[PDB]
Ligand binder design. Structure first.
Ligand SMILES: C/C=C(\C)CC/C=C(\C)CCC=C(C)C
Lengths: 145, 371, 457, 266
């Protein structure tokens, strides 16, 4: 039921996770990402974290494995918390509105260089209510979509 | 002749046993390469009447045929050559140092998601080759599945297989009871149903999924016919606490093979197209609309946040949770299953009265003794 | 193989309490000695059949069944003994599976060798300073006192040197030569002396308890150890090109580890009466009757056991010959030349007077199936084994006119050339006269002789 | 001497004397050809082998023990050999697991390395008591884990329960301490009664079925052991398995002896 699209979205997310084109995401790589997004967990934490997802995998997450997590295993509460968390991860300001520049802040963090207008467009494409901001309601509506 | 057998191979040790067929390891003298030989006693110690003696040969003569129709394929054994005598029928094939999947499933009670994926990835890709050549197996049990030192699946015992004429559907009941598709029994209990086709293998493969990931058959109970009504009706449950820890992508693909109606079953070609068996090919452009990019970056965040959240959730093992409910949480439940199969792993064998589900009690005694 | 003994260390089990145990050293040593003495002329080339020692391969290969089961252990009480080096490599060569030899040798390596030799066996305490030299026996609690501080004997390092010369591992003959040269105690006019053992100083026992095989040991015991000193010189002689493995092993025991191909077991199905020959003929079985085989005459396995009771008889020395022991296929599958009459003996599992295991025809096939399997993988004689299988009235059906299906399947199974994992060349007993182990029983050449005298006549 | 020992151990009954040596051939027959059936039995107890072979031929073609005793004399050597292989190999022709626990604790069949696992547990304890017969930790230093003399000591304590089915309950009870011992960092430092862990596990097996709807009829007590007959018939694993209740009662006993516990490595 995950569409060709959805599977593809999970795949590009897996790409954003691994800088090396390893075909795997290492404990170190995840880390580079979490710190990229500002959550700096213990190298040990990471080991456990990659372990919870894989259990064999020697500290590397794989994509077939990755999708397994990104498929909505999440409970409404569980996802809700998460959906919320990302949203915060999105707003360093924590103002509660998604800056076009804030989107850039995240990408810049994930090392993807994308056009400035395109970014505005990214929000604009998805933006009706928040002209220039994606409201959280927009975010949740969007994720399910 | 037997001289032709010993001019090329020399049997060293006994590898396995069967009802009338014995698997024996051999050395190929010209090549010094390890090979397995299955040694079927045609006369069967005198118990076989001339009909069964003839029928076993015709079954064996047919058996060479299918194994001669499929060759060079990575995940089915290669019948290197076959020798027939008046009292035996020798078949030499590849040596699999490790035993059947049943023996492996006994060692590891619950087989992990990563391991089963390539296991069946081969099996489904095995199933594609059989269906493309139009040959059904009707016998896809894990004891029919052999594994090598790299864990690669070698589907074995196409003893019950038969090539359907284009658009023909069989009626004979061939197969041990648990792994029989619903219309197998229905054709056994009715004449109107004109038969079953190549979709039979899909149900049997989907059964391995429930057995490998949970250590029990989807439908099992100690009397014979009761299992059958669970099959044709199709009452299966991803029961708790066992089946809740696995990812949701597992469940849907299990139901697809387990649908009772054959035409709606999930054929092998599209079976490999379900999200589980999708593979990460590094060199993909993967172009996306600006909404598509925004999801990816959001999903990339949503993933990282998720992984931290899921882990934070795992409850360390404490004294109390052991007292209240051991099975409920994964690490202790997998342990109880593991030391369940170390004590009574000899009590699991092939058949109905020796299946793995006999080692699991997932229902209250009262409901078990309700009728 | 069936006798418990104190063994190479004269103390029996690990406990040292007068309990004899089945040590692999004794079982292995007897197997090599039996093979060494097998058809050996004690007078040399200028000898005759009177001077030949006759050895039965039943007892030789029974020792193998114990060696394969015991190894890499030395006994049920010892996980390993360094004396197994005297069985796996030299001078016994009693193990035929090279994997067993390497596995047992490496087990000795991990569990016994240190930097002063090899311990005889775990928890030895023969001269450990934690045992009283007055008590001949050891109490059960004292065994744990000997852990990791056991005396170490360079004797077993001479065995590894000897193994390397025989195996042909120049590296092995070097690592154990420099290791032995650093433990050899110089004495008299500079000659090297092999210490019997290296013992832990009493003060340093606690240190080796914690950190194993590192404390400096003092040479104790016999100086020189005349046993170990000889193999040191023997190893030195064969390592510097003064002697070859074949000259010290003229009986070629060193080739015991080379693979042996399985033998083709010849089987001559026989009929006790003419009327049984017709039932077999009606089923298409080509057999000779018991009388048609004459001059070759068949006898029960017991008769062969009685015959060997006259081998080694010396009235003045009060020797009564071989005791009555059960004869397996390896003994009864030979062709026997007693007083110029060729003798074939029925295998023992068909003997019906002893027990009731021969009265179940489904058991005859099962015993026969394993007994051919025992024959093909464990035949070490000239010629091919010949099992003479007489079909008796008991092996027929209850009706009496048909052969029992289990035996019926067994007989055709042999004609096709494979039964029980063995290659069976079915034929007549006359055809197998020239392709069998024709052992001349010279002690019968001028009780059982009186019976055989009438039997010949 | 070996034959004399069998005849004297035949206590005068001639039928058992032959069956003792007859089975001995078959045990050696299967040992030489299939060594894997004795990997879980370190002591070959022929004498009870006739008894355990009697019960399965008693339950099959349901009849009295005396009729089975007359029946056991009656089978062919091949049938007798097959039926013994039927016993040893684990192939099945009161209850299902009650017949798989009266055939698992009467042969003293224990998993591979269980005698090598008791050694690890006893080093974390002061002993292991069964029916008030202690197997102290002093044995751990006295014999090695792989010493067969140690296997006798663990075995000798485990036959202090006469009934076979309860012994296997003790056997897997021992292992649920082994698996809980690995998780627990601290040591109990005192005696553990392996028998009791089954008893409250019997008691705790009682409560859950009462709550879920079990009648007093189905949960009927075993007259001698004190265990419910359903607990004997219960499967090993599962939500309501025997070793889930024994993984449950192997913690309340450590509650009283160990006031504070730390469980790690999951
Ligand atoms: C993590 C375990 C939690 C409840 C069970 C309690 C564990 C024990 C009470 C002691 C048994 C074994 C010890 C080996 C050292």
């Amino acid at each position: 039921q995950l569409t060709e699209e959805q599977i593809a979205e999970f795949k590009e997310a897996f790409s954003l996770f691994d800088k090396d084109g390893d075909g795997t995401i290492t404990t170190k790589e995840l880390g580079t990402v979490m710190r990229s997004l500002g959550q700096n967990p213990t190298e040990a934490e990471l080991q456990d974290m990659i372990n919870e997802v894989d259990a064999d995998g020697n500290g590397t997450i794989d994509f077939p494995e990755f999708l397994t997590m990104m498929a909505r295993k999440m409970k409404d509460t569980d996802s809700e918390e998460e959906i919320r968390e990302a949203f915060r991860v999105f707003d360093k300001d924590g103002n509660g509105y998604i800056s076009a520049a804030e989107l850039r802040h995240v990408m810049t963090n994930l090392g993807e260089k994308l056009t400035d207008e395109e970014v505005d467009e990214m929000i604009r494409e998805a933006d009706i209510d928040g002209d220039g901001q994606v409201n959280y309601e927009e975010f949740v509506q969007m994720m399910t979509a | 002749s037997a001289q032709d057998f010993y001019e090329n191979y020399e049997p060293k040790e006994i590898l396995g046993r069967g009802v009338s067929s014995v698997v024996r390891r051999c050395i190929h003298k010209p090549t010094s390469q390890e090979y397995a030989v299955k040694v079927i006693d045609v006369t069967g110690g005198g118990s076989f009447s001339p009909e069964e003696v003839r029928e076993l040969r015709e079954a064996t003569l047919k058996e060479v045929d299918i194994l001669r129709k499929v060759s060079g394929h990575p995940n089915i054994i290669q019948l290197k050559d076959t020798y027939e005598t008046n009292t035996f029928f020798f078949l030499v094939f590849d040596l699999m140092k490790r035993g059947e999947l049943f023996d492996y499933l006994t060692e590891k009670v619950t087989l992990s998601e990563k391991e089963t994926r390539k296991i069946m990835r081969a099996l489904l890709e095995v199933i594609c080759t059989l269906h493309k050549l139009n040959i059904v197996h009707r016998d896809l049990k894990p004891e029919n599945i052999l594994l090598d030192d790299n864990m690669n699946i070698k589907l074995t015992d196409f003893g019950f297989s038969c090539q359907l004429e284009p658009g023909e559907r069989l009626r004979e009941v061939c197969g041990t009871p648990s792994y029989l598709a619903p219309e197998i029994i229905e054709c056994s209990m009715n004449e109107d149903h004109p038969g079953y086709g190549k979709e039979v293998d899909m149900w049997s493969t989907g059964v391995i999924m429930y057995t490998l990931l949970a250590g029990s058959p989807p439908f099992w109970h100690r009397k014979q016919m009761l299992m059958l009504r669970m099959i044709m009706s199709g009452n299966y449950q991803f029961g708790s606490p066992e089946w809740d820890d696995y990812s949701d992508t597992v469940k849907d693909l299990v139901s697809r093979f387990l649908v009772v109606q054959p035409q709606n079953r999930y054929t092998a070609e599209e079976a490999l197209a379900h999200p589980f068996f999708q593979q990460y090919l590094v060199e993909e452009v993967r172009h996306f609309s600006p909404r598509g990019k925004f999801k990816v970056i959001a999903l990339t965040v949503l993933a990282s946040v998720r992984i931290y959240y899921q882990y934070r959730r795992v409850k360390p093992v404490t004294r109390e949770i052991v007292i209240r409910d051991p099975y409920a949480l994964r690490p202790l439940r997998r342990l109880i299953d593991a030391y369940a199969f170390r004590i009574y792993g000899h009590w699991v064998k092939k058949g109905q009265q020796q299946n793995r589900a006999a080692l699991f009690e997932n229902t209250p005694k009262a409901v078990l003794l309700s009728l | 193989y069936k006798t418990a003994d104190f063994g190479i260390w004269e103390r029996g089990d690990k406990t040292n309490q007068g309990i004899s145990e089945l040590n692999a050293s004794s079982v292995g040593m007897a197997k090599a000695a039996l093979e060494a003495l097998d058809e050996l002329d004690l007078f040399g080339v200028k000898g005759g059949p009177q001077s030949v020692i006759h050895v039965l391969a039943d007892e030789v290969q029974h020792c193998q069944s114990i060696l394969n089961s015991l190894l890499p252990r030395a006994s049920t009480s010892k996980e390993v003994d360094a004396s197994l080096l005297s069985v796996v490599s030299f001078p016994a060569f009693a193990v035929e599976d090279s994997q067993l030899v390497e596995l047992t040798k490496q087990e000795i390596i991990t569990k016994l060798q240190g930097r002063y030799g090899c311990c005889r066996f775990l928890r030895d305490g023969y001269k450990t300073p934690k045992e009283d030299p007055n008590r001949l026996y050891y109490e059960p609690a004292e065994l744990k006192l000997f852990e990791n501080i056991e005396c170490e004997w360079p004797l077993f390092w001479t065995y590894f040197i000897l193994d390397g010369v025989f195996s042909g591992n120049a590296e092995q003959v070097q690592e154990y030569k420099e290791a032995l040269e650093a433990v050899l105690i110089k004495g008299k006019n500079g000659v090297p002396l092999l210490p019997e053992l290296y013992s832990v100083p009493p003060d340093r026992v606690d240190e080796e308890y914690q950190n194993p095989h590192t404390v400096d040991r003092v040479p104790m015991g016999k100086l020189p150890h005349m046993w170990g000193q000889s193999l040191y010189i023997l190893g030195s002689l064969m390592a510097e090109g003064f002697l070859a493995p074949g000259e010290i092993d003229p009986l070629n025991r060193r080739f015991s580890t080379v693979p042996k191909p399985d033998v083709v077991v010849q089987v001559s199905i026989l009929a006790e009466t003419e009327e049984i020959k017709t039932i077999l003929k009606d089923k298409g079985i080509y057999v000779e009757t018991i009388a048609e085989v004459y001059p070759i005459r068949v006898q029960p396995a017991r008769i062969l056991s009685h015959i060997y009771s006259s081998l080694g008889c010396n009235n003045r020395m009060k020797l009564s010959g071989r005791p009555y022991r059960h004869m397996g296929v390896l003994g009864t599958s030979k062709l026997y030349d007693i007083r110029k009459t060729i003798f074939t003996f029925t295998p023992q599992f068909i003997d019906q007077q002893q027990f009731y295991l021969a009265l179940d025809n489904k058991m005859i096939v099962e015993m026969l199936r394993t007994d051919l399997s025992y024959l093909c993988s464990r035949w070490r004689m000239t010629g091919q084994p010949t099992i003479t299988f007489p079909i008796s009235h008991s092996m027929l059906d209850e009706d009496g006119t048909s052969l029992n299906s289990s035996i019926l399947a067994a007989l055709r199974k042999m004609q096709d050339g494979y039964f029980g994992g063995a290659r069976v060349q079915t034929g007549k007993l006359s055809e197998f006269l020239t392709t069998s182990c024709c052992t001349h029983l010279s002690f019968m050449d001028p009780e059982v002789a009186r019976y055989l005298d009438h039997l010949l006549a | 001497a070996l034959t004399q020992l069998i005849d004297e151990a035949s206590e005068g009954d001639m039928s058992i004397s032959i069956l003792t040596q007859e089975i001995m051939v078959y045990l050696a027959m299967y040992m030489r050809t299939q060594p894997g059936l004795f990997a879980e039995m370190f002591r070959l107890r022929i004498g009870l082998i006739i008894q355990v072979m009697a019960t399965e031929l008693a339950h099959s073609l349901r009849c009295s023990a005396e009729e089975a005793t007359e029946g056991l004399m009656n089978l062919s050597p091949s049938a007798m050999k097959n039926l013994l292989h039927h016993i040893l190999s684990g192939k099945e022709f009161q209850g299902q697991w009650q017949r798989r626990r009266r055939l698992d604790g009467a042969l003293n069949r224990v998993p591979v390395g269980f005698y090598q696992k008791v050694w690890k547990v006893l080093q974390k304890c002061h002993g292991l008591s069964v029916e008030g017969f202690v197997l102290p930790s002093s044995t751990t230093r006295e014999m090695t884990p792989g010493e067969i003399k140690f296997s006798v000591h663990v075995e000798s304590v485990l036959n202090r329960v006469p009934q076979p089915e309860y012994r296997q309950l003790l056997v897997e009870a021992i292992l649920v301490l082994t698996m809980l011992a690995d998780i627990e960092i601290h040591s109990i430092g005192s005696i553990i009664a392996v028998e009791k862990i089954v008893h409250i596990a019997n008691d705790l097996f009682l409560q859950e079925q009462k709550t879920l709807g079990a009648d007093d009829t189905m949960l009927a007590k075993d007259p001698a052991s004190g265990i419910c007959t359903l607990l004997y018939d219960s499967a090993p694993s599962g939500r309501f398995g025997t070793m889930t209740y024994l993984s449950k009662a192997a913690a309340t006993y450590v509650q009283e002896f160990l006031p504070h516990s730390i469980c790690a490595m999951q």
